[PDB]
Amino acid sequence: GDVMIHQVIHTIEFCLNCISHTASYLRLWALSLAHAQLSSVLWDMTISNAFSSKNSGSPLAVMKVVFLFAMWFVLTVCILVFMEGTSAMLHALRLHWVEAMSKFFEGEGYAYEPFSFRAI
């Protein structure tokens, strides 16, 4: 009873996961689309407005470019790097923890932590 029920659960889980993970790897397309479209619509709102062939060399038309580059760069660094690549990092992390470490990874062990004075 402890082997037959375990193999039924293993069969249901494996045959579920063969379908459920090949559709869960489509987050590689989801977050790539999100990153590409956010980096497009941030450019189009910040520095596509700063590009104009009128008032070439004017102080207002160059402080426009300076302020819009600063607003673009802090938004790229704050969102599209730190608060977007952290989400991409965590999604590539769960693709390892679930979609890759369930085909071969048992994971029933304990760490080697010896009697050491360099760890107290």
């Binding site: 009697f115 050491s116 004075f117």
Partner: protein, 129 residues
């Protein structure tokens, strides 16, 4: 070998340490950092472990070093440990009594600074009326 593809090869060795060389072998194994001990006497309780009278001592002394760490924030052989635990205890005692003769004196100071103000703010109430 390296062990990045699979784990390293463990052996489960068995030592026999006599009582003459016991602290020296234990402090050697602490510096070698290679021997992962296993609790053989799991069936024994928290007491009756054999080294419990020497561990409640360094629990108490750990508490005393924690008290010395709180007072500052508030403002080896066996004999070489045995004479330095003496200067831990002999200084914890005087620091505790001098801190307890200081906060209970600050309270007595505030009990007079509160009594001066209720005279200053109630002579003024009579001088107004």
């Amino acid at each position: 070998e390296e062990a990045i593809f699979r784990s390293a090869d463990m052996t489960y060795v068995q030592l026999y340490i006599p009582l003459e060389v016991i602290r020296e072998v234990t402090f050697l194994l602490g510096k070698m950092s290679v021997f992962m001990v296993m609790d053989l006497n799991k069936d024994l309780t928290a007491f009756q472990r054999g080294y419990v009278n020497q561990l409640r001592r360094f629990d108490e002394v750990e508490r005393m070093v924690g008290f010395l760490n709180e007072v500052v924030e508030k403002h080896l052989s066996l004999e070489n440990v045995n004479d330095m635990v003496k200067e831990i205890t002999d200084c914890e005692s005087r620091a505790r009594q001098l801190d307890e003769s200081l906060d209970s004196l600050r309270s007595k100071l505030n009990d007079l600074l509160e009594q001066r103000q209720v005279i200053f703010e109630c002579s003024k109430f009579i001088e107004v009326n």
